Amino acid sequence: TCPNHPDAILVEDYRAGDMICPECGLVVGDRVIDLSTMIGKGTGAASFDEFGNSKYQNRRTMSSSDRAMMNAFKEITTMADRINLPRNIVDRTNNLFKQVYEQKSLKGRANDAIASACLYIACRQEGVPRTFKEICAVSRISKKEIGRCFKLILKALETSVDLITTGDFMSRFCSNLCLPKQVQMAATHIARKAVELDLVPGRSPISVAAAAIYMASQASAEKRTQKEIGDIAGVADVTIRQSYRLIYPRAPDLFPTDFKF
Template sequence: IHRHLFCRLGLVATIKDRANEIYKKVEDLKSIRGRNQDAILAACLYIACRQEDRPRTVKEICSVANGATKKEIGRAKEFIVKQLEVEMGQSMEMGTIHAGDFLRRFCSTLGMNNTAVKAAQEAVQRSEELDIRRSPISIAAAVIYMITQLSEDKKPLKDISLATGVAEGTIRNSYKDLYPYAARLIPNSYAKEEDLKNLC
C-alpha cells in the first residue's frame, strides 16, 4: 500500500502493517479483480485504523485515496469485510468507535483554543452516558458546534461540516438531540447555566 497514504494521515507503522496484511488477504481472492483498486487500498487502510483503535473517518481516508469517492470506499469496505468473514468463517473484529476518537483532530482543524478543546472533550465523555442515537462522528460535530456557540470564537456550521465531513443538516439534528442535555454536558467551568440561555 502506497507510503503517502500513511504519511499524510500521520499513522503509525503498526497500522501500515495491518493494512498490508488485510490487502494481501484480499489480493488472493479472485473476486477482487476488476474492482476499483484505489478504493480497495483505502478500505484496507480504513479497516486497519479501526482494528488498531486509531479510527479515521471515511472522509479523512478519502482525502488521500487517489480519487476514490466516499461511496466507493464504503462499498469496498463492505465487500472486504464480507469476503474475509466468509474466508475466516467468523465475524471480523472492527473495534468500537467513540466521538472522542475524532474530537481532537476536528478541533485542531478548526483552530479551537485549549480551553474550548478541553470543554468539548469533557462534553463528549459525558454524552456517552446518554442514549443519543447518533453516530460518534455526528455527536463530535454537534458538541463542537455547541461549545463554539458559547465562545467568542463562534465557528460557522459550514466550517464545522467541512472539518468533520458531517453534513450541516445532520449536525443540526444531532445538536437538537443534545440541546436538552446542555446543562449536563457543558462543564460548569466553561459556561454557567445562565450562559446556556445563549444557545440557539
C-alpha cells in the first residue's frame, strides 16, 4: 500500500515498529500495534436473605447443544484416561465429535455411542488402533451398538480408515504381558509371515495376533497360559485353540532367523 509503488508488499518491522517498503523506505501508518460470567459466593453477609441462599447465583444456561458437547468431552476425557491415551488422540476425538454433532445426522443414537465411536476412529487414525473390546471395557455401551455407530460414522462423515494389520497390536500385547524385546520381534515376524503366506483365510487379525503371542510365549523360559492370553486379547480360549491347531504345521518357517529356542 506504499504510495508511488503500486503492488508492493510491506515488510512489517516488529523491532523498529513500522511498516516499511523494499523499494524506497516510506512508511504507511505511523505505528504498528501488538461469552459469560460466573457469580461466586458472597464474602459479606449483607447479600444473604432471611432464608440465606445469598440471592445472587449463576444461571448457567449456555444453550443445550454446548451442554451436550461439554458432557461429551468430559465423557471422552474420563474414558480415554482409563486406558491412558495421549491427549492428541483425545483432541482428535473431540474434533471428530464436533464434526459429527454439527453434521446433524446421528441424533437418534446416544451421545455416548458417538463418543466411543469417535474414540475408536481417532485411535484408528493415529496408527495405534485399539480393539472394539478394549473400548467396550472402558465404556458403558455394548459391542453391537459401538459397531453400528462406527458403521454409521464411516457412512455419514465420509472418511476412509486404514484396514488394521496384526503388527499394530503386538507391542501393546507383549508389553502389557511383560515380555522382552526378542519375544516382541519374534511374535511380530510370526504374525506378519502368517498373514502373508496365507494360512488364515478370513480369520480375524486379533485371533492370529494372540496366536503369535502364544507362539512366542511357548518357546522360551517364560510361559503364558491360554486364560492370560484371552484376558489380554479379549478373544476366547476356543479361538486361541482354533488358531493354534491351524497354525501349528510349518512352525520353523514362521520363526525369525535366530531366537535361542
